[PDB]
Amino acid sequence: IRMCKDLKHLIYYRFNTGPVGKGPGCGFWAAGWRVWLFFMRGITPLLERWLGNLLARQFEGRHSKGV
């Protein structure tokens, strides 16, 4: 989130330079899109393992003593 905020500042202070002002008209979404896809690369196996454990506890049942 912090990286995205920093990127926005960078983009805005390369955008609002000449006659353009502080309007909401700047949409240059490639950098934040890159950041959230690299996050999604990292968060795919962790969420896969977590939801697999959730489904296995939902269907196989919870081991009482177990480990």
Place this chain on the structure above:
RNA sequence: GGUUUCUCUUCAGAUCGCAUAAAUCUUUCGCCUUUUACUAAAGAUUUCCGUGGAGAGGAACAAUCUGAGAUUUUUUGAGGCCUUGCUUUGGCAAGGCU
């Protein structure tokens, strides 16, 4: 001595990736009632998103294509001839010849 595409197997020691996430363990910090979820540095490992080389099989298209392959100076007649020793009998070593 074809291209394109799909799948499988094997090897990566190249910035395998002119990009970059996450997790585990051991310690140091910070926040701090306690536990997750946390802070950010190191080390040891992993997973994931991708990649390169080689081989094999399949499918669709061009059906070949791409190759490798002489006289006029200095590289051709200034060529033949008797004698002495050896003849090693194809001639060698020495003289005036043309």
